[PDB]
Amino acid sequence: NPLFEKRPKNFGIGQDIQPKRDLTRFVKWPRYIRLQRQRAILYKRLKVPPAINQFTQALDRQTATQLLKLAHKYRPETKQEKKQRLLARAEKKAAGKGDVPTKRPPVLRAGVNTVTTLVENKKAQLVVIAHDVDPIELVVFLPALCRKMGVPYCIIKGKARLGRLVHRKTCTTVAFTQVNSEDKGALAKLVEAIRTNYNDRYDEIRRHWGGNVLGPKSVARIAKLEKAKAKELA
Amino acid sequence: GRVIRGQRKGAGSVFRAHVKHRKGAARLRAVDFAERHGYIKGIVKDIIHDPGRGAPLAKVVFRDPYRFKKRTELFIAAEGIHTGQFVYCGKKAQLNIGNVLPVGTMPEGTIVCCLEEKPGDRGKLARASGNYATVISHNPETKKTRVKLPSGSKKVISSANRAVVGVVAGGGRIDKPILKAGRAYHKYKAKRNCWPRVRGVAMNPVEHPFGGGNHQHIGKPSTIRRDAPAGRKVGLIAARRTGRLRGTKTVQ
Amino acid sequence: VRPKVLMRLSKTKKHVSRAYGGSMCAKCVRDRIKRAFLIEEQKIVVKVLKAQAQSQK
Amino acid sequence: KIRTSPTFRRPKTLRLRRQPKYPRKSAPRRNKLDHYAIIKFPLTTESAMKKIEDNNTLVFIVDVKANKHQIKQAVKKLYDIDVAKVNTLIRPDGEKKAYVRLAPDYDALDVANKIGI
RNA sequence: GGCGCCCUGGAAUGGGUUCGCCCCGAGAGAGGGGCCCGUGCCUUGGAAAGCGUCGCGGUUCCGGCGGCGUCCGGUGAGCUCUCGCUGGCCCUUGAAAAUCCGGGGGAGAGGGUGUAAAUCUCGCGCCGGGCCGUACCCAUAUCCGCAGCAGGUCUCCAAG
RNA sequence: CCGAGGGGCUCUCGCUUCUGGCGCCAAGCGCCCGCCCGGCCGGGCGCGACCCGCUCCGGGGACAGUGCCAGGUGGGGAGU
Ligand SMILES: [Mg+2]
């Protein structure tokens, strides 16, 4: 108000020093960064086989949440409760000496070498299989294996999220074998939303190649010829 | 059985260049936002001299666009420039003497020194004292321009190659006789260890393919093939013709 | 004098009481004073001759 | 978030102060060069004797690992006298000769007579 | 001694100048200033010491005691060294860094007054400066050549 | 393109060029906190400094290059 003069800075070429802008594109990253990004781009640029493109088509977040809820109360036995289940086992042998206390303790089996034995004996109900397993060959057979054995399978986003069901880091596969009688319709509820997408669509998920798309700076100049080639006809 | 003289120039023990009192590489400033889109102003501070070069240099202080700093370039001095002259460098720079601007924007038949053979290579072609290149033939579709090198050989280069307008200073230098053996000695003491060239006919059969004999004669034909090995390529290497030249050159 | 003895003087034996004191030569200062002022004023002139150019077209 | 420089430089991570859970040598070694081992002899030659009365100094032979700060405290603490300045000399048969000039309070002569010579 | 430093003022009938040049309306000559080097002289040091000479003590430390002296001028294509000023020769342009300093900016900081702050490249005062080399020969006898070998082996000072 | 107050087959870029000067570490505006009883201090964020996006930007490119074999040539070199 008294003086308080406005003094703008012209930022054109040949004027004041350019201000500190973003520069997060034009920054020389370490070579572990640009290895990590260029191989991500190059799973989009190459013709990906349909067995690797069995993945990248996962359950949406509503269906994964209805699934991980049901897999949460069938959580495996942590070592804390393993300590006290064996205390409560001996104190009932010190009490009653029963022949059979539990008919079947229901739980989800986890691990690919555990799951694959259950799929090929047809003892599994629903096989949740992970997404970003670091060599794919550990996992790539098992969508084709569940289809022949008749087990319904589904791909969930993230190997580390279902690895938190099992109190570990990643676990790559979980599978329901036995559920409870009050959840038998709950496991059957999601089981036709799943095999509609994966098992019934085996002939489509096997035809379906992936990748093969070009980057944005080259798909925006092929399109510029297509605008001129449409400008030619009219 | 002994190696020959030109074979010993590749190891680079005493045949390395004499580079102590030289000043730096004489290069155009690197291209960034200012020259791709506009121009930038710089003032030449002094005209200096390289030892072992025939051209002089021009040190030019520019204003850094991104940091508050004045930073000095070294240009090949185009002929006619003086100290305290404004030098403009960009795409939208105006075609005057000493201004450096891309070859695709400047017209056909302008005289060009110190030009880039691939874009952003900071000046490679037409740099010796008194030499220049001429541009013709802009192709604005598939942007390529052809220039005419100091050897009379034309070359189609990229359009965004950058180039200072004018001729290199210090021209007419080879018109003067060296005129005595002493001033050739000081000429190459700035350059290399190369000057007193013994004829291979004068040396011995260990030392050259041409030496030996009771008479100084070559004996064998002095035009040799190009796929001759090292130690045998001496004389007229893969010569298309010999004898005193007639016509102009008549071979493209 | 030598460079390391300049750490022993006081700064009256080392500069002159002008602006640009012991760095420039008292007439290039004078030239820099006139060269600075007289082209900031033409930037007033090119501002007003562009002001009365676009406004009557 | 922004990155106002085009360079990725590595972040300042944390560096713990090294606190072990056993010492590696179990005890400090005692110094083999103490103030008794600084000083070997008093030099007792004719050129070292006229340097006592005429110069207020007195000449020693010292271990060659000592410097003039250590000799200044070894002479001071063994002989209960002040030291003005010290000069040293590797004499060419291998050993370090010290020229300890005493303070003007003290006399080089009676100190010489009570140290033995 | 030097100045490509300033102010006044304006030059032709051109003048000022050098051994040579060179300089001038982008300011000559003339007048008055300013700065840099001052390794010269004067002064403090500093005459108390040094030397010359004449004595006198002290056997021995004696850095004895004393008298008088250590004074005027000139000169130069002189030799040697240094400082400077101007030229010439180059298709030859005749080093880097450590250190050190000025300048520009003005983010800050300061006592807030009938008293003193932050600061100080000013004048004095206090403390410290470790390590290693240090003799001598350096050559028709201390080096190398088998030797005290007409050989070899880098420099400075130099009178009539 | 037509024509009424304007419409966008087709379009343009921008803010530095008489001179041996200077140019950074934000002004301003809008919001928000502790601080003032409908007012005062010290901080915060945004706009100034547009948005999205998968190669840093250009130049080549399935060639060059390299690994291997086959054929030329090879006193440059080795053996006799
Ligand atoms: Mg010859």
UniProtKB/Swiss-Prot annotation, chain A:
Pfam families named in the record: Ribosomal_L7Ae
Record's GO cellular component terms: cytoplasm; cytosol; cytosolic large ribosomal subunit; cytosolic ribosome; focal adhesion; membrane; nucleolus; nucleus
Modified residues (N6-acetyllysine): 6, 69, 189
Any one GO biological process: maturation of LSU-rRNA
Molecular functions per Gene Ontology: cadherin binding; RNA binding; structural constituent of ribosome
Crosslinked positions (Glycyl lysine isopeptide (Lys-Gly) (interchain with G-Cter in SUMO2)): 20, 69, 97, 217
Compartments, record wording: Cytoplasm
Main location: cytoplasm
Keywords: Acetylation, Chromosomal rearrangement, Cytoplasm, Isopeptide bond, Ribonucleoprotein, Ribosomal protein, Ubl conjugation
InterPro entries xref list: eL8/uL1-like, Ribosomal_eL30-like_sf, Ribosomal_eL8-like_CS, Ribosomal_eL8/eL30/eS12/Gad45, Ribosomal_eL8/Nhp2, Ribosomal_eL8_euk
Subunit structure of this chain's protein: Component of the large ribosomal subunit. Interacts with CRY1. Interacts with DICER1, AGO2, TARBP2, MOV10 and EIF6; they form a large RNA-induced silencing complex (RISC).
Disease: Chromosomal recombination involving RPL7A activates the receptor kinase domain of the TRK oncogene.
PANTHER family: RIBOSOMAL PROTEIN L7AE FAMILY MEMBER
Functional description taken from the UniProt entry: Component of the large ribosomal subunit. The ribosome is a large ribonucleoprotein complex responsible for the synthesis of proteins in the cell.
Family per similarity comment: Belongs to the eukaryotic ribosomal protein eL8 family.
Protein known as: Large ribosomal subunit protein eL8
Organism listed in the record: Homo sapiens
Gene name linked to the record: RPL7A
Curated annotation (Swiss-Prot), chain B:
Transmembrane segments: none
Example GO biological process: translation
Lineage top rank: taxon: Eukaryota
Alphabetical list of Pfam families matching this protein: Ribosomal_L2, Ribosomal_L2_C
Molecular function terms, GO-annotated: RNA binding; rRNA binding; structural constituent of ribosome
Alphabetized InterPro entries for the sequence: NA-bd_OB-fold, Rib_uL2_dom2, Ribosomal_uL2, Ribosomal_uL2_arc_euk, Ribosomal_uL2_C, Ribosomal_uL2_CS, Ribosomal_uL2_dom3, Ribosomal_uL2_RNA-bd_dom
Start and end residues of each stretch annotated as Disordered: 206-231
Residues modified as (3S)-3-hydroxyhistidine: 215
Record keywords, A-Z: Cytoplasm, Hydroxylation, Isopeptide bond, Ribonucleoprotein, Ribosomal protein, RNA-binding, rRNA-binding, Ubl conjugation
Main location: cytoplasm
Cross-link (Glycyl lysine isopeptide (Lys-Gly) (interchain with G-Cter in SUMO2)): 41, 148, 233, 249
Protein modification: Hydroxylated on His-215 by RIOX1. The modification is impaired by hypoxia.
GO cellular component: cytoplasm; cytosol; cytosolic large ribosomal subunit; cytosolic ribosome; focal adhesion; membrane; nucleoplasm; postsynapse
Primary role: Component of the large ribosomal subunit. The ribosome is a large ribonucleoprotein complex responsible for the synthesis of proteins in the cell.
Additional information: This protein can be partially incorporated into E.coli polysomes in vivo, indicating it can replace the endogenous protein.
Subunit structure of this chain's protein: Component of the large ribosomal subunit. Interacts with CRY1.
Name under which the protein is recorded: Large ribosomal subunit protein uL2
Source organism (scientific name): Homo sapiens (Human)
Taxonomic placement: Eukaryota, Metazoa, Chordata, Craniata, Vertebrata
From Swiss-Prot, chain C:
Subcellular location(s) of the protein: Cytoplasm, Cytosol; Cytoplasm; Endoplasmic reticulum
Cross-link (Glycyl lysine isopeptide (Lys-Gly) (interchain with G-Cter in SUMO2)) at residue(s): 50
Disulfide bond entries: none
Function: Component of the large ribosomal subunit. The ribosome is a large ribonucleoprotein complex responsible for the synthesis of proteins in the cell.
Family statement drawn from the similarity comment of this UniProt entry: Belongs to the eukaryotic ribosomal protein eL34 family.
Self-association state and partner proteins as the record states: Component of the large ribosomal subunit.
Protein name from the UniProt record: Large ribosomal subunit protein eL34
Naturally occurring in which organism (per UniProt): Homo sapiens (Human)
Lineage of the species this protein comes from: Eukaryota, Metazoa, Chordata, Craniata, Vertebrata
Curated annotation (Swiss-Prot), chain D:
Keyword field: Acetylation, Citrullination, Cytoplasm, Isopeptide bond, Methylation, Nucleus, Phosphoprotein, Ribonucleoprotein, Ribosomal protein, RNA-binding, rRNA-binding, Ubl conjugation
Biased composition (Basic residues): 1-29
Cystines in this chain: none
Modified residues (Citrulline): 3
Post-translational modification as stated in the protein's UniProt record: N-terminus is methylated by METTL11A/NTM1. Citrullinated by PADI4.
Compartments in which it is found: Cytoplasm; Nucleus
GO biological process: cytoplasmic translation; translation
GO MF annotations, alphabetized: cadherin binding; RNA binding; rRNA binding; structural constituent of ribosome; TORC2 complex binding
N6-acetyllysine, modified sites: 32
Sequence positions bearing Phosphothreonine: 7
Modified residues (Phosphoserine): 5
Induction data: May be down-regulated by GNL2 (at protein level).
Gene Ontology cellular-component annotations: cytoplasm; cytosol; cytosolic large ribosomal subunit; cytosolic ribosome; extracellular exosome; nucleolus; nucleus
Region Beta-like import receptor binding (BIB) domain: start-end pairs: 1-36
Entry remark concerning the domains of this protein: The N-terminal beta-like import receptor binding (BIB) domain mediates interaction with IPO5, IPO7, KPNB1 and TNPO1.
Subunit structure comment from the entry: Component of the large ribosomal subunit. Interacts with LYAR and GNL2. Interacts with MDM2; this interaction may promote MDM2-mediated p53/TP53 polyubiquitination. Directly interacts (via BIB domain) with IPO5, IPO7, KPNB1 and TNPO1; these interactions are involved in RPL23A nuclear import for the assembly of ribosomal subunits. Interacts with IPO8.
Family: Belongs to the universal ribosomal protein uL23 family.
Protein name: Large ribosomal subunit protein uL23
Protein species of origin: Homo sapiens (Human)
Residues of the full protein shown: 39 to 155 of 156
